[PDB]
Symmetry: C2
Subunit: 294 residues, 2 copies
């Protein structure tokens, strides 16, 4: 019953509960996982569909232990959001994002609705906004304190201001690089590691394709790449794709030639969650400083 | 004020809240960390003290984000428990353990008091007991679901019954080896890895010192060890410790000589927390299956 006014990322000043009890989320990975971490899981959520017709919250169980099958969170649809399911969930707050296609004008006649945009400040701003929305600034501060401690533990392990890093990815015949590769890039930058010029010059929130011949320009002391394992995939498949991109690609990176090419599971690496930040920090730690080469 | 019966590990049937709101914890690592993970932080806790006079929950910030300096958990002592701070905290439940000073009989007249023993059943049992005690069985189920997903992700990454691992530790000129090294050994065992015959010979819950001449009997596809970092230590400090144990030790292990010797941060590795098991699984994954060697 007590309310609050929130200005969303479309610039809409919306009257919302101070402490919402029945949140509806229109994205699993970008909204619902954060909501779970903050201790305000939604009563219904966008999710995904297996070939057998069963549903799952993407990265839910793996990163939070929470999924459709072990909770009372209702599934509202994958590509086509079921408006009736949203209404049947009796929300006091609906949370969507600009790359979701369900019209705001439809949603706002069900319940107070807000839209949040990761493009405006990334994951840190997403969680700040969600905490403000849900009255969970307190749970957020503890999540941020843990991340502070993981970053500091990493900085204390090695001189990161002296080690160069790089995150690359096979992209259909070329190499795609981001300015900051999601969880992996965020931890590497917050820890003070330095990227090659070609990556540094990419605008924040951007990405670019690089021709395979220009691999040496993406080299660093350590080169990270990620592999899709959600579908029965293994790290060797990512080694296969790179070989298709360029036969003997390894010889073009001193990091790969020297055995400082590191493969990280992609599902964990792409999530905006605090769970993932911790997994990235641990992996970066032992891989860079806990793996002496002969 | 609804009440339940709990038989503690001394065999005492104690009438305790069904849902305790104001828990006092007499041990940071064995009780407080579990309680925080179960979503029921204590209102007062044992912890450690620095020479400057500041107080902390060992592992609290690093693994949970929760500490004395960013919460309202009251510090109640390190060596000698502050009984007046426990009174001021108005507890409805006091949790103690057998390796503690405080007479159980003084605590009894402040609030219902139970004693939990880590020696019977370990962490799984500690967590099960606390969940029943605090009414947090559903939170535990969620933590367990995430552990299942992490083990499943690891097993799907590689054929683990095809790979041998070992965990060793320098111990004053000798090598100490456990049947299962805390969190790191539990994950390796749960994921289905094989161990060297000498390690499988050690009785469950046990450990053994061996001379460094016997290092080859601890050799594996991957040899793991841990380094203490909570106090400015670095991985290189543990390598220097090994060189004292035996000069040229690296050449004596095929794993080290070939670049399959991996160093893992100790504080996380020795914790019984669900957070640790997650950091272990992720590091084992990329270290074993995500690091191509030239």
């Amino acid at each position: 019953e007590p309310v609050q006014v929130f200005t969303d990322d479309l610039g809409r000043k919306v009257t919302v509960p101070a402490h919402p009890k029945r949140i509806v989320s229109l994205h699993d990975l970008d909204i619902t996982i954060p909501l779970i971490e903050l201790g305000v899981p939604p009563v219904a959520s966008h999710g995904r569909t297996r070939p057998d017709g069963s549903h799952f919250i993407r990265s839910g169980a793996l990163l939070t232990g929470v999924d459709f099958d072990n909770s009372s969170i209702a599934f509202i649809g994958t590509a086509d959001i079921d408006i009736e399911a949203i209404v049947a969930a009796k929300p006091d707050l609906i949370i969507t994002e600009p790359t979701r296609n369900t019209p705001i004008e439809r949603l706002e006649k069900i319940a107070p609705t807000v839209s949040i945009d990761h493009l405006k400040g990334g994951a840190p701003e997403i969680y700040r906004k969600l905490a403000e929305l849900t009255g969970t600034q307190s749970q957020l501060a503890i999540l941020e304190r843990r991340y502070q401690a993981q970053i500091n533990a990493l900085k204390a392990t090695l001189d990161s201001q002296k080690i160069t890093v790089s995150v690359i990815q096979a992209n259909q015949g070329k190499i795609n690089v981001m300015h900051s590769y999601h969880s992996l890039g965020r931890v590497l930058r917050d820890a003070g590691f330095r990227f090659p010029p070609l990556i540094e010059s990419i605008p924040e929130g951007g990405r670019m394709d690089v021709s395979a011949e220009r691999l040496p320009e993406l080299d660093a002391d350590f080169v990270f790449a990620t592999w899709r394992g959600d579908t029965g995939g293994k790290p060797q498949d990512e080694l296969a794709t790179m070989e298709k991109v360029m036969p003997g690609w390894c010889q073009f990176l001193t990091a790969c030639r020297s055995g400082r090419y590191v493969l990280i599971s992609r599902e964990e690496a792409i999530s905006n969650s605090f769970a993932s930040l911790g997994l990235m920090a641990a992996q970066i730690q032992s891989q860079i400083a806990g793996r002496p080469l002969p």
